[PDB]
């Protein structure tokens, strides 16, 4: 029947992918008939690595999931910078109706938000220089797009994934594989073939390190296509990376000395924040894989904070229906909905509500922005709020 252990769009929208004990919860409630209105909150008590902020992602898919279901869904605009204890999304209705959608909704917000936050932090560490997502090879293809779409919203200029590029409305960029150069049997012959066969609109970055040292193959790629060589890629294997920084400089030198000065240094290969911070000022563009795609999820949890207009939540969870006010200076404030802010408790400024209605009784009362404009939103916040890595 099905050749891959994945879930079909229907089975997910159905709720076939939840934890059984949620089904059994619908039974108890339905049979013993315990129908009642509740308001559930979605938050985290922490962010990965105890980071200070995270990037909200997945509000879209969640709306497309609770769509056509007996509940209201308020949320923060996808891409919003958020914090622990601040509800990023609420749901109102008979728990008996939506409760069977935790397993799906939380996963949708969790891993996306995780990848995004990771990305944005990399962006920042790279001094907002260009960074391209290359990680989908380390995860299941089924989610290839959600990932690239998250790396994007996160701040990644481009995405390696084809199908992922499209669904967003972007062109999947890339460079050269080691396979190409090795099957072709010759470095020079390889990037020559690439220069001629591939379109002209495609920047031409030469995959240096293969058989010879990066230092040697770098100039070769230069003295070939010369001004056709947009950049050189360094991905020194771990067994060879004694001092990446130093290696990157030596290449710049050997190129500069031999008069090649337009060719930029593009690097990729197992790198995170700390690794990029120690090499930003000498690299032009970054290719990041696992540190973004295999990023850790945000421990997002769905907890009823109010039942029938009554404030009630379990231990370690905040109680009541609330709103989060943000001023233009990134100062956030979570307060009870029974009250309304206008002044910013701190530096007196105008503050605006973040939880906004997105689904009115199974009806999606909103138009969802295309990826790139959301990403526009993340980077603007990053800069305006002066986010720190």
Q: Any idea what DSSP says for residue 343?
A: B
225 Ramachandran zone, left/alpha/beta (phi>0; psi -120 to 50): left
CB atoms within 10 A of CB 25: 17
Instruction: Confirm or deny that 195 is annotated as ligand binding.
Output: no
The site partner of 211 among a copy of itself, Zn ion, ligand PCP, none (C-beta below 5 to 8 Å per kind) is: a copy of itself
Residue 273 CA: distances (Å) to CA of 208, 246, 292, 297: 24, 18, 10, 17
Q: Which of residues 233-262 bind Zn ion (CB under 5 A)?
A: 235
Burial annotation 119-128 (CB, 10 A radius, 16+ → b, else e): bbbbbbbbee
The site partner of 118 among a copy of itself, ligand PCP, Zn ion, none (C-beta below 5 to 8 Å per kind) is: none
Instruction: Confirm or deny that 331 is annotated as ligand binding.
Output: yes
The single residue among 84, 107, 203, 290 that binds ligand PCP, judged by CB under 6 A, is: 290
Least gap, CB of 371 to Zn ion (angstroms) = 29
Per rule CB under 5 A, is residue 23 in the interface with Zn ion? no
Q: Residue 196 in 3-state DSSP?
A: helix
The site partner of 344 among Zn ion, ligand PCP, a copy of itself, none (C-beta below 5 to 8 Å per kind) is: Zn ion
Least gap, CB of 288 to ligand PCP (angstroms) = 6
Strand pairing of 310-311 and 301-307?
Answer: antiparallel
Strand pairing of 81-82 and 231-234?
Answer: unpaired
The single residue among 68, 141, 177, 226 that binds ligand PCP, judged by CB under 6 A, is: 177
Least gap, CB of 384 to a copy of itself (angstroms) = 27
Rounded to 5 degrees, φ, ψ at 179 are: -60, -45
Gap between the Cα atoms of 200 and 44, Å rounded: 47
Instruction: Confirm or deny that 156 is annotated as ligand binding.
Output: no
Gap between the Cα atoms of 288 and 296, Å rounded: 15
Per rule CB under 6 A, is residue 288 in the interface with ligand PCP? yes
Q: Which residues are CB-contacts of 13 (< 8 A; sequence separation ≥ 6)?
A: 64, 65
Binding range to a copy of itself, per CB under 8 A, among 221-229, 233-241, 276-284, 374-382: 233-241
The site partner of 124 among Zn ion, ligand PCP, a copy of itself, none (C-beta below 5 to 8 Å per kind) is: none
The single residue among 166, 331, 364, 369 that binds Zn ion, judged by CB under 5 A, is: 331
CB atoms within 10 A of CB 132: 25
Per rule CB under 6 A, is residue 287 in the interface with ligand PCP? yes
Q: Which of residues 356-385 bind a copy of itself (CB under 8 A)?
A: none
Q: Which of residues 96-155 bind a copy of itself (CB under 8 A)?
A: 96, 99, 102-104, 106-108, 110-112, 134, 136-146, 149
Q: Which residues bind ligand PCP (CB under 6 A)?
A: 134-135, 137-138, 177-178, 235, 268-271, 287-290
Binding residues: 178, 209, 235, 327, 331, 344, 347
């Amino acid at each position: 029947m099905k050749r891959f252990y994945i879930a079909n769009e229907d089975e997910i929208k159905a709720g076939k992918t939840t934890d059984v004990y949620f089904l059994r919860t619908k039974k108890i409630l339905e049979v013993k008939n315990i129908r009642k209105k509740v308001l559930a909150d979605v938050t985290t008590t922490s962010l990965p690595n105890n980071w200070r902020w995270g990037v909200l992602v997945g509000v879209e898919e969640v709306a497309k999931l609770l769509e056509g279901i007996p509940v209201n869904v308020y949320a923060m605009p996808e891409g919003t910078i958020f914090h622990p204890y601040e509800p990023v999304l609420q749901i109102e209705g008979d728990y008996a109706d939506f409760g069977i959608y935790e397993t799906a909704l939380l996963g949708m917000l969790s891993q996306a938000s995780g990848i995004a936050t990771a990305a944005l932090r990399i962006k920042i560490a790279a001094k907002f220089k260009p960074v391209y997502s290359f990680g989908i090879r380390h995860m299941h293809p089924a989610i290839a797009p959600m990932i690239d779409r998250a790396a994007f919203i996160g701040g990644c200029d481009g995405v390696s994934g084809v199908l992922g590029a499209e669904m967003m409305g972007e062109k999947a960029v890339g460079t050269m594989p080691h396979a190409l150069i090795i099957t072709v049997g010759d470095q020079v012959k390889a990037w020559k073939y690439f220069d001629e066969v591939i379109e002209e609109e495609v920047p031409r970055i030469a995959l240096v390190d293969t058989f010879y040292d990066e230092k040697v193959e770098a100039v070769m790629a230069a003295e070939a296509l010369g001004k056709k060589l947009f950049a050189v890629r360094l991905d020194t294997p771990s067994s060879r990376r004694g001092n990446f920084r130093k290696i990157i400089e030596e290449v710049r030198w050997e190129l500069k000395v031999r008069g090649y000065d337009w060719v930029k240094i593009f690097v990729s290969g197992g790198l995170d924040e700390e690794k990029i911070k120690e090499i930003v000022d000498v690299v032009d563009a970054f290719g990041v894989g696992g540190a973004i795609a295999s990023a850790k999820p945000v421990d997002f949890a769905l907890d009823i904070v109010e039942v029938e207009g009554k404030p009630i939540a379990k231990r370690g969870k905040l109680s009541g229906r609330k709103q989060v006010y943000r001023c233009e200076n990134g100062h956030y404030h979570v307060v009870p909905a029974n009250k309304k802010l206008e002044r910013c408790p701190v530096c007196n400024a105008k503050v605006e509500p973040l939880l906004k209605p997105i689904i009115e009784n199974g009806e999606i009362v909103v138009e969802f922005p295309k990826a790139r404009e959301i990403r526009e939103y993340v980077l603007e916040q990053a800069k305006k709020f002066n986010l720190e890595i």
